């Protein structure tokens, strides 16, 4: 259940 604003394209 991640945050909808979070970007999955993390470093």
């Amino acid at each position, epitope marked *: 259940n*991640p945050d*909808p*604003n979070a*970007n*999955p*394209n*993390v470093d």
Partner: antibody
Amino acid sequence: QVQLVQSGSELKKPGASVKVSCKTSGYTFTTYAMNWVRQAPGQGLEWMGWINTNTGNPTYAPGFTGRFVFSFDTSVSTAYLQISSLKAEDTAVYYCARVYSYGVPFDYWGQGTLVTVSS
Amino acid sequence: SVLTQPASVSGSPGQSITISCTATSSNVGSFNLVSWYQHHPGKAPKLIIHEVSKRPSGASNRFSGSKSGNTASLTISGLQAEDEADYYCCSYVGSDTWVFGGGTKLTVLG
């Protein structure tokens, strides 16, 4: 504005190889992940996986491990899909799609690339 | 498939149609990351609902989305001819993976 433009139709024999490209523009290529979706004849959309455009780590869904490779060339803001040892059941339209966030996945789509595999 | 949709739905012009989408596993978790897409032939899919109900700009306000339990639902009011298409629901299923539903063929009995 945002644009995903894929390469043209491909015709291949079984066992051959193919590499589909997905040129981007209108946004920083490395900020957003690139995803791949497949539609086989008379079937629905099937998520294949994505590649992290910052770390390069690819994620392949079960069913697209072993013969598929996601890659990108940041020099030209392009993502790539390569398939090895093509099988007839690979015949499908392959799409590339961007993911903006967990809440907004697949907000921009390529126009699709038809890959036909026939003997 | 991880998300079950009706194989087909038919409506006549002007009516409102509803398309369901049931989660077959708990991998969806909260089930709050649901998205819908309109797919016309020869063209690329188009995002029309994300986060269960959020409608983005550029998609008409005749499309709405709801949820009850583990069933996401897509309603199309004032059915038009250009609405005839394939419709898919999608959900995050943990560990940076997404899954689509089988799709529904919406027919506009016009």
